[PDB]
């Protein structure tokens, strides 16, 4: 098993409150994901917003191919990679490389069309990565506040990797979703966007630290920041079914997707609001941490979890009165 | 009467997405409405202490708020004209909410075929 | 009487935020909360929607979906219990799909 | 009348991954299937068994949702509609367990 | 007012079924069925403080001093008659009167 | 204790739920079964809440209340009459 597992508390009880009669299918915005080994069983959908219409990754570069494999690998593997939460189906939508124009729009106004009808459908959406060079930004921020009105969807964004403090980066270096400021009080409340920094090993207990290095080094700043979570030593599956390891914000990202995902299997018609809330409020919070993540918060597994589903025990699974 | 009955009709790989609860002549209802896609949807409202289907109010309440909450395909076995009141009837439905299934597949689902 | 009668009120696209329960004159009673509206058992015309009502509310309550509340002013007489909470009768509820278009009688 | 009469008989170590729920001659009714396949169902106010549909409704709902391996007991015979028996079945659900292995369960 | 309900207890006395809450300084108050002027609101009572037990959400808890009085169980519990139950704004801040 | 293992059935009209605990205790609580069937529908939602769980509780029991033989045999003759929350492995709310 991986050592993030016992460090968020992804223990037996914990996952044996989810619900698996629950539809829940997980939004890989990303490079494509091939259906292999412990992805096999895992294909809900697969969409392509790219130029050469493949929903397949392809061979331009070795990272932009295992990309989107690798993130929905660490979501739901069901053998070889163990998921957070397996029991989730993937929904593929492949932005990149050669992606149209604003591919990464096309695919999330694609997931807000809601042909799907199921609330657990494409309710969480991975983005592990992002677009920079964003100089209008008036696109991201009229579709992510639409979202946040909706409140029934949650973007989960990684907030790049280069070991930069964002609040001292050129708003042209920022990786968008990640980068949405909201400004108003209602804009703040209803932010869909949960943007993901990436912790180095630890074990559940200790003091943990950002991922540093100037390649995978995890960026950060308090108010750009909402979460801290794994994302150092992270093994992932490989389109050739072999395994990979990495570090960086996307594996932190699909960790964090992955929790989300088993809360949503425990009551889908929760908003948006309510997981984000459930997420951060039984997150750990460290002095350590305040500078680099807001309220200096770390993934808590075993508490977001066991708090949601415990909230909804009565209203969904005993009703009867 | 059965729910199997090959009167009552049926819709087989369902998302049960609305809920109503209300009241009428001293009797508690409530109403749902699933869709297999964009194309259709059915509605079915289950009625207490409302015969013939009266009996099974506490059930169906039970489980149809526990499908609308999973979001899973769903077969809704349906009795059409069973309710009269013309503005409840325009509003709402004629059909009684008379069973439910859980399905394998968008028309293989558990229990009878009627 | 009915949930949709000309009468009663709504109000369409509202987060339930606040819940109370208590009991007056042998009769329990759950107050949702902007607007306000509780329903008490066997307190007629509406005491036998209480169970359903009951379940239903703190089903939304806990989803913090926006829903439709159906009301009745006038139903609760007791002045220092109209004044703490509400006269609204709850009568009925519904899901959503916007702030203003929900499941139901309108 | 008792779940851990020898007459009927028991299903360890499965998963419910059906469910069905009706109303038949006034009374209403549930169904639940686990896997070879086992189909149950359990009746309201239908007697030997009716006493204990509600604890049973619930109960098998609860491990429906949790997915976990459990010991189903039933009396076969007990419906005798035949056009409910070929539906469904003729099985009445008597009683449920926990499993700690596919074969080992809590109960008699 | 702003209480987090952190014990639960439930038992039997003299064939009504009863529960007992503790909630966090400490306040504990019973409810049970069929028995004083408050035994109407039992089930809806056990039903909000289990839910409000598993949430662990701050809660206002309404109760009457002096209903319970066998010795042994007033000992071992409280006199204190659950009466009502409120959801919080702040800590001092409740739904209801 | 933690509740490890559930089991309901039903006896003489009367249904019947069974828990175990972990040394281990079996206790089982039956409808309208006098003295203790007042409690039956409060102790099944407590004990299937606490089992759901997996936190350490305080199981009260009477002895010799269940005497059919196979039912003693393959079961208990434990009456479950109580259920509390614990802090500690010996520190539970309750008498």
């Known amino acids: ?321 | 009467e059965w729910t199997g009955d090959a009167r009552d009709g049926m819709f087989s790989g369902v998302v049960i997405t609305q809920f109503h609860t209300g009241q009428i002549d001293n009797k508690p209802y409530f109403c749902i409405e699933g869709k297999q896609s964009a194309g259709s949807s059915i509605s079915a409202c289950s009625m207490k202490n409302s015969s013939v289907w009266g009996a099974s109010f506490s059930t169906l309440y039970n489980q149809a708020l526990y499908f609308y909450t999973t979001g899973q395909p769903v077969r809704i076995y349906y009795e059409p004209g069973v309710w009269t009141y013309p503005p409840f009837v325009k509003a709402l439905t004629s059909n009684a909410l008379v069973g439910l299934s859980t399905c394998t597949t968008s028309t293989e689902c558990f229990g009878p075929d009627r």
Not at chain 1, 75 to 92: D, E, K, M, T
Not at chain 1, 255 to 269: D, E, Q, Y
Not at chain 1, 287 to 308: C, H, Q, W, Y
């Open chain 1, 1 to 321: 098993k991986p050592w993030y597992f016992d460090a968020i508390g992804l223990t037996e009880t914990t996952m044996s409150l989810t619900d698996k009669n629950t539809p829940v299918v997980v939004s890989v915005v990303d490079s494509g994901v091939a259906f292999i080994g412990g992805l096999s069983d895992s294909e809900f959908a697969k969409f392509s917003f790219t130029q050469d219409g493949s929903p397949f990754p392809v061979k331009k570069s070795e990272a932009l191919y295992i990309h989107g494999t690798a993130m929905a690998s660490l979501i739901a593997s069901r053998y070889g990679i163990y998921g957070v939460y397996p029991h989730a189906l993937i929904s593929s939508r492949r932005v990149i490389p050669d992606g149209v124009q604003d591919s990464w729009i096309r695919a999330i106004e694609s997931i807000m069309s809601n042909v799907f009808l199921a609330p657990g459908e494409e309710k969480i959406i991975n983005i592990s990565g992002g677009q920079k060079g964003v100089a209008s930004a008036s696109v991201w921020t009229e579709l992510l506040s639409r979202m946040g009105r909706n409140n029934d969807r949650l973007i989960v964004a990684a907030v790049g990797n280069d070991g930069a403090d964002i609040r001292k980066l050129s708003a042209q270096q920022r990786i968008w979703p990640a980068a949405y400021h909201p400004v108003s009080s209602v804009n703040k409340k209803q932010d869909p966007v949960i943007r993901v920094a990436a912790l180095a090993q630890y074990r559940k207990g200790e003091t943990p630290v950002l991922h540093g290095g100037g390649i995978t080094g995890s960026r950060f700043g308090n108010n750009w920041v909402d979460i801290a979570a794994p994302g150092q030593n992270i093994t992932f599956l490989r389109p050739d079914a072999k395994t990979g390891t990495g570090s960086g914000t996307s594996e932190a990202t699909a960790i964090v997707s992955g929790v989300l995902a088993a809360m949503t299997s425990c009551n889908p018609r929760a908003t948006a609001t309510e997981l984000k809330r459930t997420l951060l409020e039984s997150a750990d919070k460290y002095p350590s941490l305040v500078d680099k993540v807001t309220e200096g918060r770390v993934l808590n597994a075993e508490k977001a979890i066991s708090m949601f589903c415990k909230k909804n025990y009565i209203p969904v699974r005993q009703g009867r009165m």
